[PDB]
Design a protein around this motif. Sequence first.
Motif, PDB file in Angstrom:
ATOM      1  N   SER A   8       0.827  -1.201   0.000  1.00 29.70           N
ATOM      2  CA  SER A   8       0.000   0.000   0.000  1.00 29.70           C
ATOM      3  C   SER A   8       0.866   1.257   0.000  1.00 29.70           C
ATOM      4  CB  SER A   8      -0.927   0.006   1.217  1.00 29.70           C
ATOM      5  OG  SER A   8      -2.053  -0.828   1.005  1.00 29.70           O
ATOM      6  N   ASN A  11       0.128   7.944   2.683  1.00 31.80           N
ATOM      7  CA  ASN A  11      -0.767   9.096   2.702  1.00 31.80           C
ATOM      8  C   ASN A  11      -0.241  10.180   3.637  1.00 31.80           C
ATOM      9  OD1 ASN A  11      -2.878   6.602   2.157  1.00 31.80           O
ATOM     10  ND2 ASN A  11      -3.467   8.495   1.100  1.00 31.80           N
ATOM     11  N   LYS A  14      -4.171  10.997   5.741  1.00 33.53           N
ATOM     12  CA  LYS A  14      -4.768   9.704   6.055  1.00 33.53           C
ATOM     13  C   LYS A  14      -3.942   8.963   7.102  1.00 33.53           C
ATOM     14  CE  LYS A  14      -7.373   6.235   3.447  1.00 33.53           C
ATOM     15  NZ  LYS A  14      -6.634   4.957   3.643  1.00 33.53           N
ATOM     16  N   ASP A  15      -2.643   9.238   7.127  1.00 30.15           N
ATOM     17  CA  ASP A  15      -1.744   8.600   8.081  1.00 30.15           C
ATOM     18  C   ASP A  15      -2.370   8.555   9.472  1.00 30.15           C
ATOM     19  OD1 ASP A  15       0.399   7.704   6.611  1.00 30.15           O
ATOM     20  OD2 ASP A  15       1.515   9.593   6.756  1.00 30.15           O
ATOM     21  N   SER A  18      -5.004   5.588   9.252  1.00 27.89           N
ATOM     22  CA  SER A  18      -4.391   4.270   9.126  1.00 27.89           C
ATOM     23  C   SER A  18      -3.774   3.829  10.450  1.00 27.89           C
ATOM     24  CB  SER A  18      -3.321   4.285   8.033  1.00 27.89           C
ATOM     25  OG  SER A  18      -3.904   4.441   6.750  1.00 27.89           O
ATOM     26  N   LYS A  21      -6.079   2.602  12.902  1.00 29.57           N
ATOM     27  CA  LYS A  21      -6.604   1.328  12.425  1.00 29.57           C
ATOM     28  C   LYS A  21      -5.596   0.206  12.645  1.00 29.57           C
ATOM     29  CE  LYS A  21      -9.159   4.455  10.050  1.00 29.57           C
ATOM     30  NZ  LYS A  21      -9.566   3.875   8.742  1.00 29.57           N
ATOM     31  N   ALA A  22      -4.320   0.569  12.721  1.00 30.16           N
ATOM     32  CA  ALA A  22      -3.258  -0.406  12.933  1.00 30.16           C
ATOM     33  C   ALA A  22      -3.228  -0.879  14.383  1.00 30.16           C
ATOM     34  CB  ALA A  22      -1.912   0.183  12.541  1.00 30.16           C
TER      35      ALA A  22
END
Length: 71
Positions: A8, A11, A14-15, A18, A21-22
């Motif tokens: 992937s 970003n 967006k970082d 993400s 989400k990690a």
Amino acid sequence: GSSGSSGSPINPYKDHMSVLKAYYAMNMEPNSDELLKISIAVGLPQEFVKEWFEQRKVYQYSNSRSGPSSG
């Protein structure tokens, strides 16, 4: 099935997403200790991140099949 990814991209903003989400992807319910850092690594207010994690519970507990919140 029939899925598969090679890698992937990166970003700029967006970082901040993400990342969150990690952490969750690994742990369902973080601890006061984690929550803090989570908001730190990104720079967001722990207060905000907290709610973000709480929401997840709403979906996790609620049926996904039925028109969910998003997606």
